[PDB]
Design a protein around this ligand. Sequence first.
Ligand SMILES: [Cl-]
Ligand SMILES: [Cl-]
Ligand code: NA
Length: 309
Amino acid sequence: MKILRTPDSRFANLPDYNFDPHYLMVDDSEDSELRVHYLDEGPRDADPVLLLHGEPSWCYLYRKMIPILTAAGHRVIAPDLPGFGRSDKPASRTDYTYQRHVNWMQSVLDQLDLNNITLFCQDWGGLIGLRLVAENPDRFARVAAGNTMLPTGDHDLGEGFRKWQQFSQEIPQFHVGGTIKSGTVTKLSQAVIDAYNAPFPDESYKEGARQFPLLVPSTPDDPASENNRAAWIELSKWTKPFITLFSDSDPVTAGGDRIMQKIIPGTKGQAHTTIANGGHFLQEDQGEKVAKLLVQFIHDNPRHHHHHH
Ligand SMILES: [Cl-]
Ligand SMILES: [Cl-]
Ligand code: NA
């Protein structure tokens, strides 16, 4: 595979974003490697909070959440998926697969040796992140999920998702900022919208953004269907804390918290809530509120341990 790298001038002086870049290389699965950007904030020895973004966002989506988390003493890891943000971007839509995305984020976990993780996931950050939880029980301490899902393809995904999937593929050019506007309930400033467009100087950089909706399992024969069935059987044994923080104004994922509460034992006892005045990209509309709830969630669910452990 071939990769594109967004010029660094694109990332200059973005609103409410001043986080230094970190990088690591991951195997591209085709005999080379590509660069993953991530943020790594907060005390070096603190348990990490892993913030995974999805389609078609990047770690900028988390910028209002990160300072609240680090002020409360948390280490925060916020990676950019290949195809997005400051990460390298495979040049063909066919380069992007569900399994590759899982493997690329697994490599982040492995290289950073993240343990005792609190995951917060949304959109594809949950399609990927919940797979990582299922496949790495011993690395995760807690999970928070908002406006996400984990489809196996055995069921209809519903009105909202079907509309999105169709629109995302029909449009002549993919307007990343347009998608963020459509998935928020706030009149975003143009400089914020421009920050969502920053990774993508032209259409050639958008192949990951264009492929993502096609990778969502919607049939039982999807290449990810069985892996997601297996993930659900692991989640049905997840007894550690699991909270849902879905918002009120996202038809694509509405009600998706109920199946998590039904199936996942570690949801029992947690103070799930519905984030008011929040669209699909609830971190953009309601980042402060969500981050405060995530701080509280960690506080309400201590991990008892010795020093250095
Ligand atoms: Cl736009
Ligand atoms: Cl999608
Ligand atoms: Na429950």
